[PDB]
Amino acid sequence: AAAAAAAAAAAAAAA
Amino acid sequence: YVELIQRCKQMFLTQTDTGDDRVYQMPSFLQSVASVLLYLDTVPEVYTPVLEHLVVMQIDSFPQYSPKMQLVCCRAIVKVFLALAAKGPVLRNCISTVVHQGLIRICSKPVVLKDYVDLFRHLLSSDQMMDSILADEAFFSVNSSSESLNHLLYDEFVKSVLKIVEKLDLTLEIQTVGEQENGDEAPGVWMIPTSDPAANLHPAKPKDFSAFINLVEFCREILPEKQAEFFEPWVYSFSYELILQSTRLPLISGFYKLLSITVRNAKKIKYKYSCFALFVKFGKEVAVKMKQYKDELLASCLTFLLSLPHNIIELDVRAYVPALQMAFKLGLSYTPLAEVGLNALEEWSIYIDRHVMQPYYKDILPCLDGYLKTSALSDETISLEEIRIRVVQMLGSLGGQINKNLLTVTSSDEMMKSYVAWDREKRLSFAVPFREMKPVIFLDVFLPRVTELALTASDRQTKVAACELLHSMVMFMLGKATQMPEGGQGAPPMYQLYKRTFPVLLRLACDVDQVTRQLYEPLVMQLIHWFTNNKKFESQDTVALLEAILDGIVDPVDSTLRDFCGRCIREFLKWSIKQITPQQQEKSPVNTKSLFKRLYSLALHPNAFKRLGASLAFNNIYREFREEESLVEQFVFEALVIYMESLALAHADEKSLGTIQQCCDAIDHLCRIIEKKHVSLNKAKKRRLPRGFPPSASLCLLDLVKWLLAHCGRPQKEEGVSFLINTFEGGGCGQPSGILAQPTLLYLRGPFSLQATLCWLDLLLAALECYNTFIGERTVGALQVLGTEAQSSLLKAVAFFLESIAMHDIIASPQEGERYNYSKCTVVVRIMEFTTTLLNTSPEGWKLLKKDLCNTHLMRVLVQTLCEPASIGFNIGDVQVMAHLPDVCVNLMKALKMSPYKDILETHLREKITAQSIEELCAVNLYGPDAQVDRSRLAAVVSACKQLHRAGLLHNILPSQSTDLHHSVGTELLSLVYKGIAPGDERQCLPSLDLSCKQLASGLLELAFAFGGLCEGSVIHFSHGEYFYSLFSETINTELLKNLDLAVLELMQSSVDNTKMVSAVLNGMLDQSFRERADSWWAKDSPLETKMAVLALLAKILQIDSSVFTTYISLLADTKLDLHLKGQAVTLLPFFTSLTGGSLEELRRVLEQLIVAHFPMQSREFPPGTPRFNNYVDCMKKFLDALELSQSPMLLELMTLESVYEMFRKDDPRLSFTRQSFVDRTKLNESTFDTQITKKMGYYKILDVMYSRLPKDDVHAKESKINQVFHGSCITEGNELTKTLIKLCYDAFTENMAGENQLLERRRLYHCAAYNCAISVICCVFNELKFYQGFLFSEKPEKNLLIFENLIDLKRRYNFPVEVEVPMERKKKYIEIRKEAREAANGDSDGPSYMSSLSYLADSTLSEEMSQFDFSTGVQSYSYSSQDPRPATGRFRRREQRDPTVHDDVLELEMDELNRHECMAPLTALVKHMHRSLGPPQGEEDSVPRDLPSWMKFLHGKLGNPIVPLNIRLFLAKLVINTEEVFRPYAKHWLSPLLQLAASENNGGEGIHYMVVEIVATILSWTGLATPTGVPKDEVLANRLLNFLMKHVFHPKRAVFRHNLEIIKTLVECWKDCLSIPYRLI
């Protein structure tokens, strides 16, 4: 949930 | 310190893990074990391996250290070494070299191409702290590291650049591509290495230490030898031309403060020691050698390494007018951008100034200014400026002289050349479209271009620009020059040097842009095609173009020349394109005739070193159509030939390296196609050519002559054999000479007088006449037709008497010594060439033999190979000159054997006395220091012994010197212990006295007095340890070697007697043999332990099995038997241990034997041997099952080529770190466990069915993360073992290991599981396994009702096979069986049951649970065999509930229902592939049409747990599904969270996400399809949804942390284009 924070952060942010 | 050293290891190995295990850890081990053993002079040993491979993993293994901890690390290892002192002279060295090993191997991965650099500092650091003798440490660190690099360079890279630099050329050759890559090879290599490990580790040590060992080893005491010899061996090795070579040697050297040794004493002789001489003598050879051949890549680094060779030659500078001439110019010419050498350049300036220029400026200055001119500006029209700084700093450091040659030579540089507008009579041109104003310009764009051309700095902006509008530049000029108004008419000089440009463009574009040169090559050639098909005027022009392309070699970039012939051949392509008429062939002088007309002649005229490659790639061009195009071939044949002749002999004096004959012979490669062996074509006038060629009697004809008659003499006879005799009639005297030969020499004795016969025709006599022996009798029955001595009177006999003149010339100024010593040696060798040519050749009648009056002379010259170096050429010998010297004596003396009378041998031999050998024998030991002058003649006399060996009759020198002298070597090698340590001097003394010592006598007394003879502060502690073990085990190498050569079973003698160190003794033997051959002695070891297996082996063996005293003699022993069984098992590796050791008792068996009651070595029990049959499955199954669970904790899940190849080569027998190596790329008695477990199945996972069985034993006996190992075991071994046989052996093994047994649940799990791990990845044909399970298919139909374990493995068993089966392969071993859609679906459809009455013993699960695997598996095989209807509808009516349909009964948070349901993955690709059927074939805006016919109807997800997993199923389902096909399932989704995820509550920390994440995140999987998400059925849905969602998500951030929610806050955002507005409520 750190680089994953970027992962899902991008999941929503790009959505 | 025992179990505690264990603890050490227990950290060590366990660091093999995937996550790290730390580091300071180790030095803890280090200084620890240090003080430990420093306490102990009592020899614990046994830790030798662990401590070593320990430290070797240690020192630099790290991504980093705490910068802090690193000096601590220092005190650590250095402490290891003080221990190594008190230790007594053994293990230190070896360890050092090991860390050399990994050290450079750690170059990988190189950080100019974890990471790499670290080691430097630690090495640096290693040297620098605390107190006691940092020196020795550093010292041996160096030398062993050195020789280490020797080893890898002795592995490949020489070979590398060789082959793959030479490779594509000869591999592909169509004769079209070969020629190219030929001309591409000549001028500098392809610069391609073969194996990067070689290619690069090759840099490594050098690349590593680059700045390191320069100033390091500043030490005086330990650097006499690291100086002198230690300089050399490399420098000898050089010839292969490694970038590496010089590198440090100057750097340290000039760094080193007494070059006063070197410079002054080397002056004294110029006016050790000779070491200083050669140490000089590199200079020109080096210098030029790179200047010509080696590259801006190569040379530059090389050369520049090689300028500082002046830094040591201060006094011993002499000429070197080229030195900087080529050199420093290269400094600021091609890299004013790269200061690399540039630094040096003016360092050279510094001292050449500061050392004695007082005439030499007369030299130096005419260079300096006219060159150092750029020293000031390369700046503008470390720091370049800083350069300029120190430039002037030089200038004024003298000043007043520095003024000028810059001015007058720069005045020689053409500032002024005025050309454009044809020396400026009009506008050049204006063609470009602006023409509001219609400008003109373009006036000088050119010298601008130039200025770019020299420039690569802003080349990025600039030089680019240069070629850039060069591109349109030409086409511009010719462009309006085509109608020829003035354009060409103005051009010819203008556009002339406009050509001269592009040499530079395409030249350096290489180092700059492939895109540049390669961009403009099609353009240069689109030129050369143009005017050729056009009229020839730009012929007048491009002719000029290629003209100076005669050069390009003095021009350091010789690929210029590559350009040339490539252009030339492209020229010829176009010339082949348009060839028409010899009218226009010859009147193309640019073609055809005037080509060779010049190029041959023109080749000759300058005496051109600059034709070489030009020549080779030149005719190589033809080598394609040298066969045919038209006539000009006819001329070029002869003209080519005597062109080669005159060619060679012309320059034949001072020629550039052999690059010359590289080219010479390169074209000599053609008479091939040139000879089609026609009748009277080759035989014609072209054969009239060789007519005069041998009788040309001319100089270098040797290279040519032998070339001739084999090849060219062949066409017509055999080689032309009998063409010859009828001319011998007239004369064979036609071949030889001797005009003015012998006496006038004896008078003038001049260098000018050396210049023909003495120059060549000595040689041409020798070889010219050698090739004659062969044909007919020529040297007997042809040349000699007139008299025995009559016809050769002034020819061959004077050649004798002139060899007598060589003896004389030793009886009673550099270039002087050059041809003087070069000569006298070239004399003895070549006159002995045809000498021994005759002597050996069967045309031996004593006709020319008696003709010698040198009978005693010959034996008086050769008898001294001692004075011979000190007098005639020696230094020059190393290059394959006196390297070849031994080749003489043997060849000579044995061609002196037989017919030639033995006194030639004998009286000669009789010349030798014993006082030489006995004397020197005494002396070199009698020295200590002073070992020089004798020790030499150790090397020499030994070399003579070589010559005796190949020559026999050695014993004639040593009849009783067999006895004593060889003994006395023992007296002396004996004697050393008085002084203990021996000099690196004496360290080179020993190879002599031992090496030749044992060339005759026995290596047994070796072993005996080895053992006993060794059974014996600086004086006394340097005495202390070698007493105990070392000194002979120090000298050990040669000793072992003796033991390797001729010994058989002689081993077993002293072996069995002493029964202790012999092992070690033997151990050194082991691979010292092996490595040498890696097949020779690999038996010799084997039966000596067939019998000795009974003998020395045994008392050891059952001394262990028997056994404080006998107990440690045991740990001693069993340690041996490790070794014995292991190395001896390595010579079994060729064959067998199960026959060889299998048919041979107490070899196989001792494995099982010694296992009792010891862990630490119990590690090492297993890795040896692949024993087979009986008492092995069983007894060893006990020593592993029983002795494992007993000796390994019961606790379930409680635990814890050439180059690089050489790292293992010398650590072969030992060192547990072996595979702990590359893994660098609570737990304690648990570490005893997996210590031993990793000891267990990592080793043999690969082979045998008990090796197979024991893993299955323990895993089920005690489940641990050992199971993880199983993957990198099973799967690996599955792919790995690659034995279809043993494949099937576990196929059946496991297969009916699933038979009727006491097996438990997991006991079938890992069974089929790890089973499949190996099996899915192994060979697709599983044979009766996969067929007998077909005949275990009916095993599936079955009833065990019920019992328990009968019920357990009832269900475990019949799902068990399909478990591996269908996954490992479902297909194509399954396809012909014609159960496809047919006979299995029986067991799927039926197999999973209700068992609604079963409440029992997890029958309600495991029975029903695993029963579902019917549909799981079989349905999968169907998924690819599917209809769409078939697999979907085959599911009805449901047994449901079923276990996967019994859900929240447990597992109340959402995490592993995706991970641990063990259901998805089939369901995944299920709907994946059958959704490839139903898919882009057709989509659905509707829910139903994708479900009801699908099995997606089976999915509903409503009303309870009936909800959740199904829609859990939807999880990755919708990944493919969409569009609106999940339309109602969408309603399922927003339905999902409401009271259900609520029913699951938080459902795991990340759970709420886990649901909603794509619950909504699918809502955005579309835009307008969210018009559904808002409007139609959302009716109550999203309102409540939100309410909860929000409700929850508020806090848990409050509960735990922050942007968690925000993840939702998104979703929140994502919602609303209308929706349900619970917002006032918000």
Give the DSSP per-residue string, B510-570: HHH-HHHHHHHHHHHHHHHHHHHHS-SSHHHHHHHHHHHTT-SSSSS-THHHHHHHHHHHH
Determine the Cα–Cα distance for residues B640 and B620; give it in Å rounded to an integer.
12
Question: Could you tell me the two tokens for B549?
Answer: 């392309």
- Nearest residue to B281 (alpha-carbon basis) of B232, B337, B247, B321: B232
Q: How far apart are CA B57 and CA B70, in angstroms?
A: 16
Contact of B135 with chain A, judged by CB distance below 8 Å, is answered with: no
Contact yes or no for B1610 and A5 at CB 8 A? no
CA B817 to chain centre: 41
Q: How far is B1610 from chain A (nearest CA, A)?
A: 6
Residues of B in contact with A8 (CB under 8 A): 1553, 1557, 1607
Inform me whether the C-beta atom of residue B1561 falls under 8 Å from chain A C-beta atoms: yes
Q: Tell if the CB–CB gap between B1614 and A11 is shorter than 8 Å.
A: no
How far from chain centre, in Å, is Cα B1544? Answer: 60
Instruction: Check A8 against B1561: CB less than 8 A apart.
Output: no
Angle, CA B1595 vertex, CA B1593 and CA B1598 arms, to 5° = 130
Q: Which two tokens stand for residue B493?
A: 């000089």
* Residue A15: closest C-alpha in chain B: B1564
Alpha-carbon span B368 to B346, nearest angstrom: 11
B1610·A15 Cβ contact <8 A = yes
Cα B107 from chain centre: 12
Q: How many whole angstroms separate alpha carbon B468 and alpha carbon B471?
A: 6
Nearest CA in chain A to B1563: A15
**Rg of chain B's alpha carbons, rounded to an integer?**
43
Give the residue from B1029, B898, B911, B876 showing the smallest Cα distance to B952.
Answer: B898
Longest distance between any two alpha carbons in chain A, whole Å: 19
Dihedral of alpha carbons B527, B528, B530, B531, sign: positive
Interrupted backbone of chain A, residues before each interruption (C–N > 2.5 Å) = none
Asked if the Cβ–Cβ distance from B1607 to A13 is below 8 Å, we say no
* Interface membership of A14 toward B (CB under 8 Å): no
**Which residues of B725-776 form beta strands (DSSP E)?**
none
Spatial separation of the C-alpha atoms in residues B1256 and B1270, rounded to whole Å: 10
Tokens representing B1267? 């199971």
Please compute, for residue B25, the number of CA atoms within 13 A of its CA located in the half-sphere on the CB side: 18
Residues of chain A contacting B1605 with CB distance shorter than 8 Å:
none
Contacts of B787 (CB under 8 A, 6+ apart): B793
Residue-level length of chain B: 1626
Residue B906: φ, ψ to 5°: -80, -65
Transcribe B1186-1215 into DSSP letters: IHHHHHS---TT-----TTTHHHHTTTT--
Instruction: Please name which of B1341, B1372, B1362 lies closest in space to residue B1298, comparing C-alpha atoms.
Output: B1362
How many Cβ pairs within 8 Å bridge chains A and B? 19
The answer to whether residues B873 and B825 touch, using CB atoms and an 8 Å cutoff, is: yes
Nearest CA to B838 among B791, B777, B890, B883?
Answer: B777
Say how many CA atoms lie within 13 Å of B467 toward its Cβ: 28
Number of neighbouring beta carbons within 10 Å of residue B1020: 8
Residues of A in contact with B1614 (CB under 8 A): 12, 15
Q: CA dihedral in degrees (B349, B355, B361, B367; nearest 10)?
A: -20
Query: Does B1561 sit within 8 Å of A15, measured CB to CB?
Result: yes
Beta-carbon contacts of B580 under 8 Å, excluding residues fewer than 6 positions away, are: none
Radius of gyration of chain A (CA): 7
DSSP, res B1497: T
- Nearest to residue B136, comparing CAs of B69, B80, B57? B80
DSSP string, B1353-1415: HHHHHHHHHHHHHHHH--SSSSSTTS-SSSSSHHHHHHSS---TT--STTIIIIIHHHHTHHH
Angstrom distances, CA of residue B929 to CA of B139, B374, B559, B925, B1244: 19, 52, 53, 9, 54
Contact A12, B1607 (CB under 8 A): yes
Residues in chain B with CB shorter than 8 Å from the CB of A13 are 1610
Q: Quick check: bond before B1437 cis, omega within 30?
A: yes
Nearest CA in chain B to A7: B1607
Contact B258, B270 (CB under 8 A): no
DSSP string, B433-489: S--SS-----TT-HHHHHHHHH--SGGGTHHHHHHHHHHHHHHHHHHHHSS-SSHHH
Helix (H, G, I), strand (E, B) or coil at B580: coil
Three-state secondary-structure class, residue B755: coil
B1482 touches chain A (CB under 8 A): no
Q: Which residues contact B1578 (CB under 8 A, 6 or more apart)?
A: B1534, B1572, B1619, B1620
| Separation between Cα atoms, residue B1536 and residue B1552, nearest integer Å | 11
Task: Name the minimum distance, in Å, from the CA of B1565 to any CA of chain A.
Answer: 8
CA distance B1607 to chain A (A): 7
Distances (CA, A) of B1246 to B783, B1220, B1222, B1283: 72, 19, 20, 10
Q: Is B1283 helix (H, G, I), strand (E, B) or coil?
A: coil
What is the residue whose two structure tokens read 């479900």?
A: B1491
Does residue B1611 belong to the interface with chain A, where contact is any CB pair within 8 Å? yes
Q: Please tell me what resolution, in angstroms, this structure has.
A: 6.6
Residues of B in Cβ contact (< 8 Å) with A15 = 1561, 1564, 1610, 1614
Nearest to B1533 by CA among B1491, B1469, B1581, B1476: B1581
DSSP 8-state code for residue B110: P
Torsions phi, psi for B63 (to 5 deg):
-60, -45
Q: What is the number of alpha carbons within 13 Å of residue B714 lying toward its C-beta?
A: 12
Q: Which of B517, B478, B512, B518 is nearest to B498 (CA)?
A: B478
Burial class (CB in 10 A: 0-12, 13-18, 19+), B102: buried
Question: What is the rounded CA–CA span in Å between residue B737 and residue B796?
Answer: 8
Distance from CA of A6 to the nearest CA of B (A): 11
Q: Which residue of A has its CA nearest to B1554?
A: A8
CB contact under 8 A, B1607 and A12: yes
CB contact under 8 A, A8 and B1611: no
Nearest chain B residue to A9, by CA:
B1607
Integer Cα distance of B1401 and B1399 in angstroms: 7
* Gap from B1603 CA to chain A (nearest CA, Å): 9
Determine whether B1213 is exposed, middle or buried from the number of CB atoms within 10 Å of its CB (0-12, 13-18, 19+). middle
H/E stretch holding B796: none
Residues with Cβ within 8 Å of residue B733, at least 6 apart in sequence: B783, B786, B791, B792, B795
CB B699 within 8 A of CB B761: yes
Query: Residue A12 and residue B1603: Cβ atoms within 8 Å?
Result: no
Whether residue B1611 and residue A13 make contact (CB cut-off 8 A), yes or no, is no
Q: Does residue B1614 sit at the A interface (CB-CB below 8 Å)?
A: yes
- List the end-to-end C-alpha distance of chain B, in Å, as a whole number: 70
What is the rounded CA–CA span in Å between residue B765 and residue B166?
35
Which DSSP string corresponds to B1232-1262? HHHHHHIIIIITTSSS-HHHHHHHHHHHHHS
Cα–Cα distance for residue pair B797/B772, rounded to 1 Å: 17
Distance from C-alpha of B182 to C-alpha of B176, rounded to nearest angstrom: 10
Residue A2 contacts B where some CB pair is shorter than 8 Å? no
Count of C-beta atoms within a 10 Å radius of residue B190: 15
Per-residue CA distances from B523 to B590, B1197, B1488 (Å): 19, 73, 68
Please enumerate in sequence order all residues whose Cβ is within 8 A of that of B483, keeping only pairs 6 or more positions apart, or say none: none
DSSP E strand boundaries for B209-356: none
Give me B997's structure tokens.
Answer: 């010592």
C-alpha B331/C-alpha B1059 separation (Å) is 65
What tokens were used for B93? Answer: 């060295």
Please count the CA atoms within 13 angstroms of the CA of B1301 that sit on its side-chain side.
15
Distance of CA B2 to the CA centre of its chain: 40
B1561 vs A contacts (CB less than 8 Å): 11-12, 15
**B1519 to chain A: which residues are within 8 Å by CB?**
none
**Peptide bond connecting B1346 to the previous residue in cis, omega within 30 degrees of 0:** yes
Angstrom distance (rounded) from CA B132 to CA B79? 9
Check: CB of residue B510 under 8 Å from CB of residue B557.
yes
Residues B998, B968: contact at Cβ < 8 Å? no
CB B629 within 8 A of CB B595: no
Nearest residue, CB atoms, B1614 vs list A1, A5, A15: A15
Peptide bond into B109 cis (omega under 30): yes
- Sequence-separated contacts (24+) of B349-357 with Cβ below 8 Å: B349/B394, B350/B394, B351/B310, B351/B311, B351/B314, B352/B310, B352/B314, B352/B317, B353/B394, B353/B397, B353/B398, B355/B314, B355/B315, B355/B317, B356/B314, B356/B315
Chain B CB within 8 Å of residue A15 CB:
yes
First to last CA, chain A: 19
CA-closest candidate to residue B571, choices B609, B545, B548 = B545
Question: Does an H or E element contain B1176, and which?
Answer: none
Tokens of B479: 């462009």
Alpha-carbon distance of B1032 to B1068, in angstroms, equals 12
Per the CB < 8 A criterion, the answer to whether B1408 and B1439 are in contact is: yes
Distance from the A9 Cα atom to the nearest Cα atom in chain B, whole angstroms: 7
Which residue pairs, CB below 8 angstroms and at least 24 apart, start in B484-489? B486/B422, B486/B426, B487/B429, B488/B537, B488/B538, B489/B422
Count Cα atoms within 13 angstroms, Cβ side, for B822: 16
Query: Would you list the DSSP string of B1098-1121?
Result: HHHHHHHHH--HHHHHHHHHHHHH
- CA B602 to centroid of chain Cα atoms: 44
Measured in residues, chain A has a length of 15
**Do the beta carbons of residue B778 and residue B724 sit within 8 Å?**
yes
Q: Where are the alpha helices (DSSP H) in B896-977?
A: 902-911, 915-927, 932-951, 964-975
Residue B247 phi/psi, 5-degree rounding, is: -40, -70
What is d(CA B1133, CA B1128) in angstroms, rounded to the nearest whole number?
Answer: 9
Give the DSSP letter of residue B865: S
Q: Does residue A5 sit at the B interface (CB-CB below 8 Å)?
A: yes
